[PDB]
């Protein structure tokens, strides 16, 4: 059971916990800088042991409103933001994604 | 072990324990006003389904593009993290881990 946390970019934290072929995740932090729509989060990459074979789309929600987003974890670990351009908000979201 | 409860404000939560994993389903409909960032005080998630770490369950409101999230902290006192709402049909199926 390996655990990892890192600020992907823009203040967004991603926490991961590997349990066999399944990775448990938790989106954290708050948006502290501007994140462009469909942009790479270049501050931190997901380590190799948590990188999936297939591009995984993690659906999150912004605190206080009806707003949803998704962050993709590709096989490279360079996460991509698929919400619109944003510079504020509290992103949250717990779930799992598969590995091999 | 299975459990169902009307958390508060009309929101139902159905749960099923399978080893270290809890399966969930958000049900019902918002029948009264629920404040933004408020505790759902009518029902508490029983101990056997309570996680070690806070779980943020992302749901969707039927008929629109609206999303929300409900937090299940270790206490089982769920929290609503959508805006203040008094109507809508909340849905969302998934799993969350336990120990």
């Amino acid at each position, epitope marked *: 059971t390996k655990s990892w*946390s890192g*600020e992907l970019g823009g*203040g967004i*934290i991603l*926490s991961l916990r590997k349990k066999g072929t399944t990775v448990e995740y938790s989106i*954290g*932090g*708050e*948006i*502290s800088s501007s994140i462009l729509a469909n942009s790479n989060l270049v501050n931190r990459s997901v380590p190799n042991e948590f990188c999936p074979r297939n591009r995984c789309s993690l659906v999150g929600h912004m*605190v206080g409103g009806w707003n949803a987003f998704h962050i993709d974890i590709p096989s490279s670990g360079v996460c991509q933001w698929f919400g619109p351009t944003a510079s*504020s908000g*509290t992103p949250r979201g717990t779930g799992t994604y598969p590995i091999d | 072990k299975s459990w169902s409860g009307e958390l508060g404000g009309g929101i139902i939560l159905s749960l099923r324990k399978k080893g270290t994993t809890v399966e969930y389903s958000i049900g019902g409909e918002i029948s009264s006003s629920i404040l933004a*960032n408020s505790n759902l005080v009518n029902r508490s998630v029983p101990n056997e389904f309570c996680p*070690r*770490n*806070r779980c943020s369950l992302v749901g969707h409101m039927v008929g629109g593009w609206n999303a929300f999230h409900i*937090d299940i*902290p*270790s206490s089982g006192v769920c*929290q609503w993290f959508g805006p203040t709402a008094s109507s809508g049909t909340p849905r969302g199926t998934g799993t969350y881990p336990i120990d």
Partner: nanobody
Amino acid sequence: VQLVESGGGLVQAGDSLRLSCAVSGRSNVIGWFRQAPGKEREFVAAISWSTGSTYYGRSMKGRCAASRDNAKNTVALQLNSLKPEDTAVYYCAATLDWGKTLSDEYDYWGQGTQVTVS
């Protein structure tokens, strides 16, 4: 978890102030929050007691640093380039979870310490 804030008082624009949180009980992460009267409570910083990892909120980015010493069993919050806007009561908080930024996500709280910048 018992939390007691120390340090804080009156200082001028551009000055620095070190706040201390004496922690008792048992490991969590220690969060730092600030609330100005008639204003929204803001997350400042957090630190994991077991790892030492830090995270800084939007409020004081490039202008605060958290640290942990055990014993003293103390968490220090260092503020720099202080401006009368950073004037608020500074709170210390605790949780099992990383990386929470909402007041609602923290279980144990401290009395606070006033910080006045002129």
